[PDB]
Structure 1
Amino acid sequence: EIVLTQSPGTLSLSPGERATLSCRASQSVSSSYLAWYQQKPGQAPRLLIYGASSRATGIPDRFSGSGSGTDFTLTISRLEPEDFAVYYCQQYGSSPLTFGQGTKVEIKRTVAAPSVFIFPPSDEQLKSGTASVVCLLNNFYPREAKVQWKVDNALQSGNSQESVTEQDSKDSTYSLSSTLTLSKADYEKHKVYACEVTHQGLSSPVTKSFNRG
């Protein structure tokens, strides 16, 4: 089969900048049989470009494609807010049909440090035998961030989960919520609960903490 490799994984650019997205094939593909799709969160993929360089119906002029042999590009000449999405290339010349792994185009803005907040478990939850400790990292950029949970100075690993919001439509930042989960028994055996946050915008790690009780 023909394997399609897209690069970069993530493209970070400001509105008005030119986006150049790459799709490399494991062997030569006729330009007639290379397509690009756009996908927004919670939406089906939409055809953008077909035959390497032709715009699909309804697609604005700022989208273009070029390439042949093993190397293809999708170009967005000047990015609009609505263009920030995931893009997939696809070949349909030789079966089986294959897709690239996708490139996310996200908004580059000025680096912004997270505001950090820690929340102890509720007394109601403790009654049930489990303790959830929550750390919020609010309104930061870029997306990459590190949460390090500490319990009486012991670095925790493997007992936490986190998720991140979609890039904010107004300020282009992200927020992150992390939950440390431990048994009520473990929670009551220890005193100091700390969330240490590392991020590009912080000169040094920020730690928020509480003492149990």
Structure 2
Amino acid sequence: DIVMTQSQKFMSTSVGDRVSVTCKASQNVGTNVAWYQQKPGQSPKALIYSASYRYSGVPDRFTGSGSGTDFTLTISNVQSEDLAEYFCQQYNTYPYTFGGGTKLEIKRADAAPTVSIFPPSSEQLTSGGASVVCFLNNFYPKDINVKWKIDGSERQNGVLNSWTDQDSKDSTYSMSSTLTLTKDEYERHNSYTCEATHKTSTSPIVKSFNRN
């Protein structure tokens, strides 16, 4: 089969700049090459066909070039909503084959996390479990740590963390941390705290509640 190679799995740019994603075919595929965009949780969307023609409704900031084996997707005046994975593909010969993808990352200014903590709902407690949730939202850059304390003591087991990709509107990151306890364990303690450490503050950014 024809191998399509994208040798930059990640490329970093800034809003308003120009970025070029490269793609190399192992053998001549003429101009029978397409480009696709894929954002998290979504199907792929075609950008370019015949190596240089834009699909309907695709902004003219997207341009394609190349013939033979070297192909380029160029994005001019990069917008925050261009945050996505980009795939090249040849349909010259069976089987049609895709490049490995290139993820676009957008540089922006530092942003401190907005922290919110939530107690277990009465709905969850009615069946014997108890999750405490902490959202650490809209921060930049991506590096961040979260620490849970129960009545002042650090709690490590029972914590599950999840992170979003960069937001399509403001290019920040967010994170969700969930501390799951039993209802019985939860009701033995009063103070519940989640602490974020991020480069935007030399102290932890903290949120708490008392079960009172």
- Normalising to structure 1: TM-score of the pair? 0.74
1:19 corresponds to: 19
Amino acid in the other structure paired with 1:167: D
Q: Report the counterpart of residue 36 of structure 2 in structure 1.
A: 37
CA contact (8 A) 1:159 1:182 kept: no
User: For residue 185 of structure 1, what is the aligned residue in structure 2?
Assistant: 184
2:137 counterpart of 1:138: yes
Aligned-pair CA distance for 1:181: 1.4
Determine if the alignment matches structure 1 residue 52 to structure 2 residue 51.
yes
Which secondary structure state, in structure 1, belongs to the residue aligned with residue 6 of structure 2? strand
| Inter-partner Cα distance in structure 1 for 2:49 and 2:149 | 52
For 1:132-177, what per-residue CA distance to the aligned partner results, in whole angstroms no more than 9, with x for missing partners?
A: 10112133223454333344634425642435386163x4434433
Residue 125 of structure 2 corresponds to which residue in structure 1?
126
Q: Structure 1, residues 24-69: CA drift from partner, whole Å, max 9, x if none? A: 45x2342423220134566643332233334445544432234466
- Going from structure 1 to structure 2, the CA distance change for 1:200 and 1:71 (only over 3 Å counts) comes to farther
Q: Residues 42 and 189 from structure 1, CA distance in 2 versus in 1: closer, same or farther, beyond 3 angstroms?
A: closer
CA distance in 2, matches of 1:104, 1:154: 36
Residue 112 in structure 1 maps to residue 111 in structure 2:
yes
Distance 1:57 1:189, change over 3 A: closer
1:73-112 correspondence runs (5 A): 73-80=72-79, 83-112=82-111
- The worse-fitting range, judged by mean Cα deviation, of 63-72 and 113-122 is 63-72
Contact 1:29 1:91 in 2 (8 A): no
Secondary structure of 2:124's counterpart equals: helix
* Equivalent-residue separation in structure 1 for 2:185 and 2:75 (angstroms): 53
Change (3 A) 1:29 1:149: farther
Change (3 A) 1:200 1:88: farther
- Name the SS for the 1:32 alignment partner: coil
State whether residues 66 and 74 of structure 1, in contact with CA within 8 Å, keep that contact through their aligned partners in structure 2.
yes
Q: Which amino acid aligns with 1:90?
A: Q
Instruction: Give the partner amino acid of 2:76.
Output: S
CA distance in 1, matches of 2:4, 2:144: 30
Quick one: which amino acid aligns to residue 73 of structure 2? Answer: L
Separation of aligned partners in 1, 2:55 and 2:121? 54
**RMSD after superposition:** 3.4
Structure 2 counterpart of 1:195: 194
Change (3 A) 1:144 1:8: farther
Structure 1's 38 and 2: CA in aligned 2 closer, same or farther, altered over 3 A?
same
Instruction: From the superposition, tell whether residues 162 and 41 of structure 1 become closer, same or farther in structure 2 (CA, over 3 Å).
Output: closer
User: Aligned partner of 2:186: which letter?
Assistant: Y
Return the letter of the residue paired with 2:156. Q
**Contact 2:29–2:67 under 8 Å retained in 1:** yes
Secondary structure at the aligned position of 1:125 is classed as helix
